[PDB]
Amino acid sequence: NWLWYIRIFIIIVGSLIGLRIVFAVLSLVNRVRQGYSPLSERDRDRSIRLVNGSLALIWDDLRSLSLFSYHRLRDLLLIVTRIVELLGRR
Amino acid sequence: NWLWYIRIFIIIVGSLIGLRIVFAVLSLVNRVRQGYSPLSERDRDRSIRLVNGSLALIWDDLRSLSLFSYHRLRDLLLIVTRIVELLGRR
Amino acid sequence: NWLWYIRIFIIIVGSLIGLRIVFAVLSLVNRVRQGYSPLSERDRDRSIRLVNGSLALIWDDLRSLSLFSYHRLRDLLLIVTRIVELLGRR
């Protein structure tokens, strides 16, 4: 058989691109490891802090929108409507 | 499922990959929303500024190449050749 | 004139997904050139250094481990576990 061996392979490729998303997260790590501004070396000590920073990195977004349990976010959500109205008049 | 249903199924995955380019705009929002590099911020109001940022986002890249008009870009393009010539020099 | 053309097309579908990864490199350029924060451009002269930045960009990650003399990399590996070790305990 050829289709089956090559077919599952495509499914693996599909899995492969799902893997690519971590690179977005990697870029945050890259900022510190790769020096955000035009990179044209001590920060590795701080870079290891990214191990724990992985938990906090995803937490900043989760807590920024909601802050506390799924309830406080209702207050933050109103800001989105208010911002277009407020910005509408520079 | 059969190869026919799976054939297009593989094709959808092909569509899935292009979606990732759009994620790059998300990373700008994400890092700002994440405070900064390995954080282990008031700017959230500023993050929402990125809402209108869709217009400005293409403008930073668009204005960098030409700057102001769209004919000047021919002049700006010459700059890149000078960089390699100048940087290659002692 | 269907599955045969499509089977190789499937092969091409695999290659193109990996092509997308260079954009992560583009994101570094975009970060500074497109404004790391909600961009809602004289710095281009400085951004030009990012052109040669390609050589430096890969080296920050590679050179961080050893810094100087590959032998030094052996000592770096040990301290890396130590950092996590310190974090592991109160």
PDB file of C-alpha atoms in Angstrom:
ATOM      1  CA  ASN A   1       0.000   0.000   0.000  1.00  0.00           C
ATOM      2  CA  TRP A   2       1.133   3.592  -0.673  1.00  0.00           C
ATOM      3  CA  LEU A   3      -1.901   5.856  -0.120  1.00  0.00           C
ATOM      4  CA  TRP A   4      -2.309   4.708   3.499  1.00  0.00           C
ATOM      5  CA  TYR A   5       1.342   5.170   4.484  1.00  0.00           C
ATOM      6  CA  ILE A   6       1.523   8.536   2.675  1.00  0.00           C
ATOM      7  CA  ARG A   7      -2.024   9.524   3.913  1.00  0.00           C
ATOM      8  CA  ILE A   8      -1.331   9.175   7.659  1.00  0.00           C
ATOM      9  CA  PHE A   9       1.861  11.085   6.891  1.00  0.00           C
ATOM     10  CA  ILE A  10      -0.295  14.056   5.853  1.00  0.00           C
ATOM     11  CA  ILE A  11      -2.179  13.717   9.150  1.00  0.00           C
ATOM     12  CA  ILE A  12       1.258  13.906  10.848  1.00  0.00           C
ATOM     13  CA  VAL A  13       1.949  17.104   8.824  1.00  0.00           C
ATOM     14  CA  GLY A  14      -1.407  18.458  10.098  1.00  0.00           C
ATOM     15  CA  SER A  15      -0.142  17.739  13.613  1.00  0.00           C
ATOM     16  CA  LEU A  16       3.127  19.392  12.602  1.00  0.00           C
ATOM     17  CA  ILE A  17       1.503  22.787  11.939  1.00  0.00           C
ATOM     18  CA  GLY A  18      -0.389  22.536  15.276  1.00  0.00           C
ATOM     19  CA  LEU A  19       3.144  22.349  16.740  1.00  0.00           C
ATOM     20  CA  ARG A  20       4.127  25.601  14.935  1.00  0.00           C
ATOM     21  CA  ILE A  21       1.850  27.692  17.246  1.00  0.00           C
ATOM     22  CA  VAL A  22       4.308  27.306  20.196  1.00  0.00           C
ATOM     23  CA  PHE A  23       6.711  29.470  18.116  1.00  0.00           C
ATOM     24  CA  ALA A  24       4.352  32.392  18.861  1.00  0.00           C
ATOM     25  CA  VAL A  25       5.005  31.662  22.546  1.00  0.00           C
ATOM     26  CA  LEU A  26       8.695  31.093  21.635  1.00  0.00           C
ATOM     27  CA  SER A  27       8.856  34.660  20.274  1.00  0.00           C
ATOM     28  CA  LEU A  28       8.120  35.996  23.773  1.00  0.00           C
ATOM     29  CA  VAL A  29      11.017  33.826  25.024  1.00  0.00           C
ATOM     30  CA  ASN A  30      12.996  35.031  21.992  1.00  0.00           C
ATOM     31  CA  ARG A  31      12.502  38.653  23.078  1.00  0.00           C
ATOM     32  CA  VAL A  32      14.633  38.014  26.145  1.00  0.00           C
ATOM     33  CA  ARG A  33      16.985  35.336  24.696  1.00  0.00           C
ATOM     34  CA  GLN A  34      17.303  36.939  21.247  1.00  0.00           C
ATOM     35  CA  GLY A  35      17.309  40.626  22.363  1.00  0.00           C
ATOM     36  CA  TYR A  36      14.068  42.206  20.997  1.00  0.00           C
ATOM     37  CA  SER A  37      15.751  45.310  19.436  1.00  0.00           C
ATOM     38  CA  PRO A  38      18.089  44.829  16.347  1.00  0.00           C
ATOM     39  CA  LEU A  39      20.269  42.019  17.708  1.00  0.00           C
ATOM     40  CA  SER A  40      23.181  43.080  15.442  1.00  0.00           C
ATOM     41  CA  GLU A  41      24.411  37.945  27.064  1.00  0.00           C
ATOM     42  CA  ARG A  42      23.738  37.753  30.844  1.00  0.00           C
ATOM     43  CA  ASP A  43      19.953  37.657  30.229  1.00  0.00           C
ATOM     44  CA  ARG A  44      20.152  33.805  30.056  1.00  0.00           C
ATOM     45  CA  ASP A  45      19.997  33.735  33.879  1.00  0.00           C
ATOM     46  CA  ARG A  46      16.735  35.685  33.624  1.00  0.00           C
ATOM     47  CA  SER A  47      15.789  33.572  30.570  1.00  0.00           C
ATOM     48  CA  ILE A  48      15.636  30.442  32.766  1.00  0.00           C
ATOM     49  CA  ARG A  49      13.053  32.424  34.784  1.00  0.00           C
ATOM     50  CA  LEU A  50      10.866  31.729  31.718  1.00  0.00           C
ATOM     51  CA  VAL A  51      10.378  28.152  33.072  1.00  0.00           C
ATOM     52  CA  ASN A  52       8.031  29.611  35.710  1.00  0.00           C
ATOM     53  CA  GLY A  53       7.387  32.518  33.344  1.00  0.00           C
ATOM     54  CA  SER A  54       5.441  30.071  31.142  1.00  0.00           C
ATOM     55  CA  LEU A  55       2.680  29.969  33.786  1.00  0.00           C
ATOM     56  CA  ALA A  56       2.745  33.754  34.314  1.00  0.00           C
ATOM     57  CA  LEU A  57       3.029  34.520  30.563  1.00  0.00           C
ATOM     58  CA  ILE A  58      -0.359  32.935  29.833  1.00  0.00           C
ATOM     59  CA  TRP A  59      -1.722  34.330  33.146  1.00  0.00           C
ATOM     60  CA  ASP A  60      -1.161  38.036  32.258  1.00  0.00           C
ATOM     61  CA  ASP A  61      -3.660  37.714  29.375  1.00  0.00           C
ATOM     62  CA  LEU A  62      -6.127  35.640  31.453  1.00  0.00           C
ATOM     63  CA  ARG A  63      -6.052  38.052  34.419  1.00  0.00           C
ATOM     64  CA  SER A  64      -5.890  41.261  32.318  1.00  0.00           C
ATOM     65  CA  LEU A  65      -9.281  40.548  30.707  1.00  0.00           C
ATOM     66  CA  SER A  66     -11.044  39.023  33.745  1.00  0.00           C
ATOM     67  CA  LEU A  67      -8.667  39.457  36.763  1.00  0.00           C
ATOM     68  CA  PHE A  68     -10.692  37.225  39.132  1.00  0.00           C
ATOM     69  CA  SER A  69     -13.051  34.246  38.501  1.00  0.00           C
ATOM     70  CA  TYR A  70     -15.329  34.392  35.426  1.00  0.00           C
ATOM     71  CA  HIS A  71     -17.478  37.335  36.602  1.00  0.00           C
ATOM     72  CA  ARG A  72     -15.172  40.357  36.983  1.00  0.00           C
ATOM     73  CA  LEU A  73     -14.508  40.086  33.230  1.00  0.00           C
ATOM     74  CA  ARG A  74     -18.066  41.340  32.612  1.00  0.00           C
ATOM     75  CA  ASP A  75     -16.826  44.735  33.857  1.00  0.00           C
ATOM     76  CA  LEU A  76     -13.727  44.669  31.614  1.00  0.00           C
ATOM     77  CA  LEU A  77     -15.851  43.613  28.621  1.00  0.00           C
ATOM     78  CA  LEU A  78     -17.883  46.858  28.817  1.00  0.00           C
ATOM     79  CA  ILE A  79     -14.666  48.835  28.197  1.00  0.00           C
ATOM     80  CA  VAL A  80     -14.526  47.513  24.593  1.00  0.00           C
ATOM     81  CA  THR A  81     -17.819  49.280  23.702  1.00  0.00           C
ATOM     82  CA  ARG A  82     -16.826  52.352  25.688  1.00  0.00           C
ATOM     83  CA  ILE A  83     -13.462  52.628  23.920  1.00  0.00           C
ATOM     84  CA  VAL A  84     -14.941  52.951  20.386  1.00  0.00           C
ATOM     85  CA  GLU A  85     -17.421  55.584  21.637  1.00  0.00           C
ATOM     86  CA  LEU A  86     -14.716  57.458  23.578  1.00  0.00           C
ATOM     87  CA  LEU A  87     -12.175  57.210  20.743  1.00  0.00           C
ATOM     88  CA  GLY A  88     -14.864  58.132  18.167  1.00  0.00           C
ATOM     89  CA  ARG A  89     -14.291  61.733  19.355  1.00  0.00           C
ATOM     90  CA  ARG A  90     -10.532  62.426  19.446  1.00  0.00           C
TER      91      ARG A  90
ATOM     92  CA  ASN B   1     -14.696   9.083   5.558  1.00  0.00           C
ATOM     93  CA  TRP B   2     -12.888   7.546   2.546  1.00  0.00           C
ATOM     94  CA  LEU B   3     -10.035   9.196   0.603  1.00  0.00           C
ATOM     95  CA  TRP B   4     -12.464  11.722  -0.988  1.00  0.00           C
ATOM     96  CA  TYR B   5     -13.711  13.168   2.304  1.00  0.00           C
ATOM     97  CA  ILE B   6     -10.145  12.934   3.653  1.00  0.00           C
ATOM     98  CA  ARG B   7      -8.704  14.504   0.439  1.00  0.00           C
ATOM     99  CA  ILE B   8     -10.473  17.791   1.097  1.00  0.00           C
ATOM    100  CA  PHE B   9      -9.830  17.235   4.826  1.00  0.00           C
ATOM    101  CA  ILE B  10      -6.109  17.450   4.070  1.00  0.00           C
ATOM    102  CA  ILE B  11      -6.850  20.533   1.901  1.00  0.00           C
ATOM    103  CA  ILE B  12      -8.563  22.288   4.891  1.00  0.00           C
ATOM    104  CA  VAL B  13      -5.316  21.724   6.851  1.00  0.00           C
ATOM    105  CA  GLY B  14      -3.599  23.534   3.945  1.00  0.00           C
ATOM    106  CA  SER B  15      -5.948  26.463   4.691  1.00  0.00           C
ATOM    107  CA  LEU B  16      -5.074  26.137   8.389  1.00  0.00           C
ATOM    108  CA  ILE B  17      -1.394  27.038   7.791  1.00  0.00           C
ATOM    109  CA  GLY B  18      -2.092  30.483   6.196  1.00  0.00           C
ATOM    110  CA  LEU B  19      -4.141  31.393   9.297  1.00  0.00           C
ATOM    111  CA  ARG B  20      -0.864  31.432  11.289  1.00  0.00           C
ATOM    112  CA  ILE B  21       0.382  34.592   9.459  1.00  0.00           C
ATOM    113  CA  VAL B  22      -2.523  36.431  10.965  1.00  0.00           C
ATOM    114  CA  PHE B  23      -1.449  35.158  14.427  1.00  0.00           C
ATOM    115  CA  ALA B  24       1.656  37.357  14.028  1.00  0.00           C
ATOM    116  CA  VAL B  25      -0.542  40.458  14.593  1.00  0.00           C
ATOM    117  CA  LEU B  26      -1.855  38.646  17.731  1.00  0.00           C
ATOM    118  CA  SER B  27       1.715  38.286  19.077  1.00  0.00           C
ATOM    119  CA  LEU B  28       2.078  42.079  19.150  1.00  0.00           C
ATOM    120  CA  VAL B  29      -1.132  42.259  21.182  1.00  0.00           C
ATOM    121  CA  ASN B  30      -0.123  39.262  23.278  1.00  0.00           C
ATOM    122  CA  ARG B  31       3.328  40.558  24.370  1.00  0.00           C
ATOM    123  CA  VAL B  32       1.947  44.000  25.177  1.00  0.00           C
ATOM    124  CA  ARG B  33      -0.913  42.281  26.994  1.00  0.00           C
ATOM    125  CA  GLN B  34       1.718  40.043  28.708  1.00  0.00           C
ATOM    126  CA  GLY B  35       3.581  43.049  30.198  1.00  0.00           C
ATOM    127  CA  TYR B  36       6.880  42.179  28.435  1.00  0.00           C
ATOM    128  CA  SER B  37       9.545  39.440  28.140  1.00  0.00           C
ATOM    129  CA  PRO B  38       9.558  36.648  30.907  1.00  0.00           C
ATOM    130  CA  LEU B  39       7.441  38.582  33.407  1.00  0.00           C
ATOM    131  CA  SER B  40       6.963  35.632  35.879  1.00  0.00           C
ATOM    132  CA  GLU B  41       0.275  46.771  33.632  1.00  0.00           C
ATOM    133  CA  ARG B  42      -1.917  49.849  33.062  1.00  0.00           C
ATOM    134  CA  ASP B  43      -1.173  49.652  29.301  1.00  0.00           C
ATOM    135  CA  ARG B  44      -4.245  47.333  28.861  1.00  0.00           C
ATOM    136  CA  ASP B  45      -6.230  50.470  27.953  1.00  0.00           C
ATOM    137  CA  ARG B  46      -3.412  51.118  25.452  1.00  0.00           C
ATOM    138  CA  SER B  47      -3.619  47.513  24.200  1.00  0.00           C
ATOM    139  CA  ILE B  48      -7.245  48.169  23.205  1.00  0.00           C
ATOM    140  CA  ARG B  49      -5.738  51.067  21.147  1.00  0.00           C
ATOM    141  CA  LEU B  50      -4.543  48.291  18.811  1.00  0.00           C
ATOM    142  CA  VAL B  51      -8.294  47.941  17.918  1.00  0.00           C
ATOM    143  CA  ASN B  52      -7.797  50.931  15.607  1.00  0.00           C
ATOM    144  CA  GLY B  53      -4.255  49.567  15.213  1.00  0.00           C
ATOM    145  CA  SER B  54      -5.422  47.501  12.218  1.00  0.00           C
ATOM    146  CA  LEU B  55      -5.147  50.644  10.045  1.00  0.00           C
ATOM    147  CA  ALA B  56      -1.868  51.783  11.624  1.00  0.00           C
ATOM    148  CA  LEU B  57      -0.299  48.258  11.557  1.00  0.00           C
ATOM    149  CA  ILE B  58      -0.118  48.185   7.739  1.00  0.00           C
ATOM    150  CA  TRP B  59       0.847  51.887   7.814  1.00  0.00           C
ATOM    151  CA  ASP B  60       4.080  51.317   9.840  1.00  0.00           C
ATOM    152  CA  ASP B  61       5.329  48.837   7.206  1.00  0.00           C
ATOM    153  CA  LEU B  62       3.774  50.795   4.288  1.00  0.00           C
ATOM    154  CA  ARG B  63       5.231  54.160   5.373  1.00  0.00           C
ATOM    155  CA  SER B  64       8.683  52.656   6.132  1.00  0.00           C
ATOM    156  CA  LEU B  65       9.306  51.504   2.543  1.00  0.00           C
ATOM    157  CA  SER B  66       8.213  54.729   0.752  1.00  0.00           C
ATOM    158  CA  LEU B  67       7.537  57.281   3.547  1.00  0.00           C
ATOM    159  CA  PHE B  68       4.729  59.808   2.821  1.00  0.00           C
ATOM    160  CA  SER B  69       4.186  59.284  -0.965  1.00  0.00           C
ATOM    161  CA  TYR B  70       4.365  56.149  -3.189  1.00  0.00           C
ATOM    162  CA  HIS B  71       6.840  57.472  -5.843  1.00  0.00           C
ATOM    163  CA  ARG B  72       9.602  58.255  -3.323  1.00  0.00           C
ATOM    164  CA  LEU B  73       9.839  54.498  -2.606  1.00  0.00           C
ATOM    165  CA  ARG B  74      11.928  54.234  -5.778  1.00  0.00           C
ATOM    166  CA  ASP B  75      14.426  56.556  -4.008  1.00  0.00           C
ATOM    167  CA  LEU B  76      14.170  54.632  -0.716  1.00  0.00           C
ATOM    168  CA  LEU B  77      14.839  51.348  -2.545  1.00  0.00           C
ATOM    169  CA  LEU B  78      18.271  52.689  -3.557  1.00  0.00           C
ATOM    170  CA  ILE B  79      19.137  53.000   0.165  1.00  0.00           C
ATOM    171  CA  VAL B  80      19.286  49.183   0.600  1.00  0.00           C
ATOM    172  CA  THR B  81      22.018  48.902  -2.081  1.00  0.00           C
ATOM    173  CA  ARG B  82      24.032  51.544  -0.199  1.00  0.00           C
ATOM    174  CA  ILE B  83      23.822  49.555   3.038  1.00  0.00           C
ATOM    175  CA  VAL B  84      25.624  46.518   1.594  1.00  0.00           C
ATOM    176  CA  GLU B  85      28.153  48.786  -0.145  1.00  0.00           C
ATOM    177  CA  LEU B  86      28.796  50.869   3.005  1.00  0.00           C
ATOM    178  CA  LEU B  87      28.701  47.990   5.535  1.00  0.00           C
ATOM    179  CA  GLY B  88      31.060  45.894   3.371  1.00  0.00           C
ATOM    180  CA  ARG B  89      33.611  48.757   3.554  1.00  0.00           C
ATOM    181  CA  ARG B  90      36.285  48.740   6.296  1.00  0.00           C
TER     182      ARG B  90
ATOM    183  CA  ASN C   1      -5.787  13.473 -13.785  1.00  0.00           C
ATOM    184  CA  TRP C   2      -7.056  13.791 -10.173  1.00  0.00           C
ATOM    185  CA  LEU C   3      -5.609  11.654  -7.327  1.00  0.00           C
ATOM    186  CA  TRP C   4      -2.274  11.418  -9.189  1.00  0.00           C
ATOM    187  CA  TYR C   5      -1.891  15.194  -9.516  1.00  0.00           C
ATOM    188  CA  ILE C   6      -3.353  15.631  -6.015  1.00  0.00           C
ATOM    189  CA  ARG C   7      -1.017  13.037  -4.337  1.00  0.00           C
ATOM    190  CA  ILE C   8       2.095  15.066  -5.241  1.00  0.00           C
ATOM    191  CA  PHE C   9       0.142  18.252  -4.494  1.00  0.00           C
ATOM    192  CA  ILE C  10      -0.248  16.733  -1.038  1.00  0.00           C
ATOM    193  CA  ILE C  11       3.576  16.466  -0.905  1.00  0.00           C
ATOM    194  CA  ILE C  12       3.797  20.196  -1.727  1.00  0.00           C
ATOM    195  CA  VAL C  13       1.234  20.910   1.054  1.00  0.00           C
ATOM    196  CA  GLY C  14       3.851  19.541   3.526  1.00  0.00           C
ATOM    197  CA  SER C  15       6.745  21.783   2.347  1.00  0.00           C
ATOM    198  CA  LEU C  16       4.858  25.089   2.333  1.00  0.00           C
ATOM    199  CA  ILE C  17       3.780  24.751   6.061  1.00  0.00           C
ATOM    200  CA  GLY C  18       7.477  24.850   7.149  1.00  0.00           C
ATOM    201  CA  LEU C  19       8.057  27.880   4.872  1.00  0.00           C
ATOM    202  CA  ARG C  20       5.809  29.864   7.254  1.00  0.00           C
ATOM    203  CA  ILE C  21       8.416  29.595  10.085  1.00  0.00           C
ATOM    204  CA  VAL C  22      10.692  32.320   8.544  1.00  0.00           C
ATOM    205  CA  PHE C  23       7.851  34.751   9.457  1.00  0.00           C
ATOM    206  CA  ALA C  24       8.937  34.328  13.102  1.00  0.00           C
ATOM    207  CA  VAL C  25      12.209  35.914  11.896  1.00  0.00           C
ATOM    208  CA  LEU C  26      10.096  38.603  10.136  1.00  0.00           C
ATOM    209  CA  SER C  27       8.313  39.187  13.463  1.00  0.00           C
ATOM    210  CA  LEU C  28      11.618  40.319  15.009  1.00  0.00           C
ATOM    211  CA  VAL C  29      11.960  42.851  12.175  1.00  0.00           C
ATOM    212  CA  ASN C  30       8.282  43.746  12.499  1.00  0.00           C
ATOM    213  CA  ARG C  31       8.638  44.185  16.261  1.00  0.00           C
ATOM    214  CA  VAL C  32      11.037  47.109  15.948  1.00  0.00           C
ATOM    215  CA  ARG C  33       9.980  48.320  12.487  1.00  0.00           C
ATOM    216  CA  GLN C  34       6.208  48.023  13.151  1.00  0.00           C
ATOM    217  CA  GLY C  35       6.388  49.293  16.768  1.00  0.00           C
ATOM    218  CA  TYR C  36       6.485  46.545  19.449  1.00  0.00           C
ATOM    219  CA  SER C  37       3.522  48.250  21.205  1.00  0.00           C
ATOM    220  CA  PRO C  38       0.100  49.202  19.589  1.00  0.00           C
ATOM    221  CA  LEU C  39       1.473  51.258  16.683  1.00  0.00           C
ATOM    222  CA  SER C  40      -1.860  53.170  16.531  1.00  0.00           C
ATOM    223  CA  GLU C  41       9.785  56.160  11.005  1.00  0.00           C
ATOM    224  CA  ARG C  42      13.232  57.854  11.011  1.00  0.00           C
ATOM    225  CA  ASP C  43      14.439  54.798  12.997  1.00  0.00           C
ATOM    226  CA  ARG C  44      14.732  52.959   9.618  1.00  0.00           C
ATOM    227  CA  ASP C  45      18.437  53.932   9.464  1.00  0.00           C
ATOM    228  CA  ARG C  46      18.982  52.069  12.762  1.00  0.00           C
ATOM    229  CA  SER C  47      16.630  49.260  11.707  1.00  0.00           C
ATOM    230  CA  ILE C  48      18.988  48.768   8.725  1.00  0.00           C
ATOM    231  CA  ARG C  49      21.462  47.157  11.147  1.00  0.00           C
ATOM    232  CA  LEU C  50      18.886  44.349  11.468  1.00  0.00           C
ATOM    233  CA  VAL C  51      19.888  43.421   7.853  1.00  0.00           C
ATOM    234  CA  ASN C  52      23.232  42.114   9.171  1.00  0.00           C
ATOM    235  CA  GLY C  53      21.235  41.144  12.289  1.00  0.00           C
ATOM    236  CA  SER C  54      20.544  37.760  10.633  1.00  0.00           C
ATOM    237  CA  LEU C  55      24.077  36.595  11.547  1.00  0.00           C
ATOM    238  CA  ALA C  56      23.827  37.977  15.108  1.00  0.00           C
ATOM    239  CA  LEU C  57      20.226  36.724  15.546  1.00  0.00           C
ATOM    240  CA  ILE C  58      21.127  33.014  15.466  1.00  0.00           C
ATOM    241  CA  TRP C  59      24.316  33.586  17.523  1.00  0.00           C
ATOM    242  CA  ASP C  60      22.574  35.085  20.629  1.00  0.00           C
ATOM    243  CA  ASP C  61      20.915  31.671  21.174  1.00  0.00           C
ATOM    244  CA  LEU C  62      24.010  29.589  20.178  1.00  0.00           C
ATOM    245  CA  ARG C  63      26.633  31.767  21.892  1.00  0.00           C
ATOM    246  CA  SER C  64      24.562  32.197  25.095  1.00  0.00           C
ATOM    247  CA  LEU C  65      25.342  28.585  26.092  1.00  0.00           C
ATOM    248  CA  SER C  66      29.167  28.709  25.757  1.00  0.00           C
ATOM    249  CA  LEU C  67      29.863  32.471  25.316  1.00  0.00           C
ATOM    250  CA  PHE C  68      33.500  31.643  24.501  1.00  0.00           C
ATOM    251  CA  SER C  69      35.336  28.300  23.969  1.00  0.00           C
ATOM    252  CA  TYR C  70      32.897  25.380  23.489  1.00  0.00           C
ATOM    253  CA  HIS C  71      34.425  23.861  26.670  1.00  0.00           C
ATOM    254  CA  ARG C  72      32.736  26.686  28.628  1.00  0.00           C
ATOM    255  CA  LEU C  73      29.348  25.305  27.481  1.00  0.00           C
ATOM    256  CA  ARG C  74      29.871  22.349  29.849  1.00  0.00           C
ATOM    257  CA  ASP C  75      29.861  24.674  32.880  1.00  0.00           C
ATOM    258  CA  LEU C  76      26.817  26.581  31.540  1.00  0.00           C
ATOM    259  CA  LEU C  77      24.771  23.356  31.408  1.00  0.00           C
ATOM    260  CA  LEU C  78      25.324  22.770  35.139  1.00  0.00           C
ATOM    261  CA  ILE C  79      24.351  26.282  36.281  1.00  0.00           C
ATOM    262  CA  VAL C  80      21.182  26.044  34.157  1.00  0.00           C
ATOM    263  CA  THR C  81      19.947  23.106  36.324  1.00  0.00           C
ATOM    264  CA  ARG C  82      21.003  25.087  39.448  1.00  0.00           C
ATOM    265  CA  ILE C  83      18.688  27.991  38.559  1.00  0.00           C
ATOM    266  CA  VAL C  84      15.693  25.625  38.282  1.00  0.00           C
ATOM    267  CA  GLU C  85      17.021  23.873  41.427  1.00  0.00           C
ATOM    268  CA  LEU C  86      16.833  27.127  43.426  1.00  0.00           C
ATOM    269  CA  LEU C  87      13.302  27.756  42.127  1.00  0.00           C
ATOM    270  CA  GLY C  88      12.286  24.145  42.903  1.00  0.00           C
ATOM    271  CA  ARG C  89      12.787  24.854  46.629  1.00  0.00           C
ATOM    272  CA  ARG C  90      11.341  27.767  48.656  1.00  0.00           C
TER     273      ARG C  90
END
